[PDB]
């Protein structure tokens, strides 16, 4: 799995791959690794399929209760801490999850939180999580600018996951894009690597190694 | 089932009295007289063995009990209550002291433990206060000889000499007259025997009277030899014979 999320001028970009494995067996090429916590909160998933899906879906339920109780939208910080604190209660039991809680509140503005099953919770502008994180980092790190266009940022994100899907045997399938602005997240499609690779190769001239 | 009595049975009345403690004290007042006199080298506690039938064997019923080898007790009031209180007192002397410090508790602390047990029966849910007043006499290295009284409320006080029960008022007065801070143990035993005679209606001898002392160490009552530091218990109950001998010099 490869997932990234980064803050820039136009908000936040969130991109993930969609492969699932059990050893060398590719169990799925069509899995959703991004849960829309709500109109303004996104959660990325990496690690154990069940652990992520279950606990993040549960996270969503917790955020909804916060809003009914406080008549206010949960903060990215508070939402991420719910998951972090839950996951910490289970520390040592074997939960396996590398997650990213991304949202936009009037109070915090664009915000990203890294939360993993070790109990680590970190706030930052750029994060890549998963077996293919290093591959994404290589592409994302060398082309990042706070001043990218909502168009360019989206592309770098998309391109970064592509890179990872290519080199990491445990990442692949398709790329799912998201753009976060105060009016919420904006889905930006599902790009199958099967076609995205060749398109990017031709139009960009990269992946010069592979023969086409 | 299940004790659903989790509320107090002793509460404050508009006047500020705690009825059950008062009533417990009344039960004590009806009890056979008992007393204690502190001498310069010992303490004496005594009482009447009010046998409830000439067919009963009064020996099989000790009103005077050893708590630790240097501490004894006697009472006035409800006998059964006293009995279980002695069982508890003997045990707390171990659980809360011997097992921690490896030595028996000093008289004041054990008294304090007993008092605590009684105080609780004054506030815990579903119980009535103990219907007894105790007189505990003992000795410990750093406090010497002492004599205490513990009432149903859980309050206790140290005495030079005192009496409880039936004719306590009369006996207390008789003691105030004969007591002084120079009495030897034998003198106190004598004064004790005299005070008790005024409270006894019928037969007055070593079979109708129960008396014990906290005095010198009885190496003969230790049960073993070979350890210099272990000299024997200071608590000794007088035998029927030992009493009679002192009665002829009454």
């Amino acid at each position: 799995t490869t997932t990234l999320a980064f803050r820039f001028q136009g908000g936040i970009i969130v991109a993930v791959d969609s492969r699932a494995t059990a050893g060398n067996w590719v169990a799925s090429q069509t899995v959703k690794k991004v849960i829309e916590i709500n109109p303004f909160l996104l959660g990325t998933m990496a690690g154990g399929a069940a652990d992520c899906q279950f606990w993040e879906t549960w996270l969503g339920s917790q955020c909804r209760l916060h809003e009914l109780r406080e008549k206010e939208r949960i903060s990215v910080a508070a939402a991420s801490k719910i998951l972090s604190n839950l996951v910490y209660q289970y520390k040592g039991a074997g939960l396996s999850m590398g997650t990213m809680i991304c949202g936009y509140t009037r109070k915090e503005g664009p915000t990203i939180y890294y939360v993993d099953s070790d109990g680590t919770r970190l706030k930052g502008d750029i994060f890549c999580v998963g077996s293919g994180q290093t591959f994404a980092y290589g592409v994302l790190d060398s082309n990042y600018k706070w001043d990218l266009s909502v168009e360019d940022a989206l592309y770098l994100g998309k391109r970064s996951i592509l890179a990872a899907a290519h080199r990491d045997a445990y990442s692949g399938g398709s790329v799912n894009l998201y753009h976060v602005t105060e009016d919420g997240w904006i889905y930006h499609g599902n790009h199958d690597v099967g076609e995205l690779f060749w398109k990017v190769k031709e139009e960009e001239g990269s992946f010069n190694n592979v023969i086409g | 089932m299940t004790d659903r009595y989790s509320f107090s049975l002793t509460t404050f009345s508009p006047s500020g009295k705690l009825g059950q403690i008062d009533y417990a004290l009344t039960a004590v007042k009806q009890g056979v007289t008992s007393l204690g006199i502190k001498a310069t080298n010992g303490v004496v506690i005594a009482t009447e063995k009010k046998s409830s039938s000439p067919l009963a064997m009064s020996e099989t019923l000790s009103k005077v009990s050893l708590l630790t080898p240097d501490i004894g007790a006697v009472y006035s009031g409800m006998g059964p209550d006293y009995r279980v209180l002695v069982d508890k007192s003997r045990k707390v002397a171990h659980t809360s002291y011997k097992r921690i410090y490896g030595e028996y508790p000093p008289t004041k602390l054990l008294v304090s433990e007993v008092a605590k047990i009684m105080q609780e029966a004054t506030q815990s849910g579903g119980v009535r206060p103990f219907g007894v007043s105790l007189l505990i006499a003992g000795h410990d290295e750093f406090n010497g000889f002492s004599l205490y009284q513990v009432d149903p409320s859980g309050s206790y006080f140290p005495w030079k000499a005192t009496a409880i029960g039936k004719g306590s008022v009369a006996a207390k007065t008789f003691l105030e007259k004969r007591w002084n801070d120079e009495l030897e143990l034998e003198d106190a035993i004598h004064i004790a025997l005299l005070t008790l005679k005024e409270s006894v209606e019928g037969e007055f001898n070593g079979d109708t009277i129960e008396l014990a002392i906290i005095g010198d160490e009885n190496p003969d009552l230790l049960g073993y030899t070979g350890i210099p530091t272990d000299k024997g218990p200071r608590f000794r109950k007088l035998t029927s014979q030992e009493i009679n001998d002192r009665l002829e010099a009454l």
Partner: protein
């Protein structure tokens, strides 16, 4: 491990703590503040096991703040440190112990003297002129054993750290991405935003 250093000079306690947060093969963050302010004049740095680290720090923070509001008073550095030691000492014999090491630097307004306490996850506490947790101590204790003086000014103290940090950047295998330095004195806690080149 992470770099956790502390040095008590004349009128203050300086705490230097590495900024890196590395997990496996990647350095996830390079601006991490491994410190929590327990009270206006008491600062605590920490390093250790991934989750236990912050969870513990914030837990202690919460309790001290609660004490402060209940009593409308600030516990002395010595008192706060004793509380932390006992917490860790309970922890070591529990189901899952907090694997956290800490340095507590505070200015005792009543004694008007800075204090530095070093406490490891076993609940081992010791008061020192200077302390460190982890592998750092191996190269910084002899350094300070050499260049340290009780009457040093806060400025001489910062120079001293810089010297420690340089030794750590030359011989340590890991890239801890610099440190964040904070000063604790009679006027509270302030951060030296300019250490990246002081």
């Amino acid at each position: 491990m992470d770099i956790i250093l502390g040095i008590r000079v004349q009128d203050s306690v300086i705490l230097a703590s590495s900024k890196a947060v590395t997990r496996g093969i990647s350095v996830l963050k390079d601006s991490d503040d491994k410190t929590r302010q327990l009270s206006p004049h008491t600062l605590m740095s920490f390093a250790g096991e991934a989750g236990d680290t912050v969870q513990f720090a914030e837990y202690i923070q919460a309790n001290i703040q609660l004490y402060s509001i209940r009593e409308d008073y600030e516990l002395s550095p010595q008192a706060v440190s004793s509380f932390v030691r006992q917490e860790l000492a309970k922890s070591i014999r529990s189901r899952r112990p907090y694997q956290v090491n800490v340095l507590i630097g505070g200015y005792d307004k009543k004694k008007n003297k800075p204090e530095l306490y070093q406490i490891d996850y076993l609940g081992t506490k010791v008061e020192l002129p200077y302390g460190a947790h982890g592998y750092s101590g191996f190269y910084t204790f002899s350094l300070l054993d050499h260049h340290y003086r009780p009457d040093m000014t806060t400025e001489e103290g910062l120079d001293l750290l810089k010297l420690c940090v340089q030794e750590l950047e030359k011989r340590m295998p890991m890239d801890f991405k610099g440190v964040i330095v904070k000063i604790v004195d009679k006027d509270g806690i302030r951060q030296v935003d300019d250490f990246q080149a002081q």
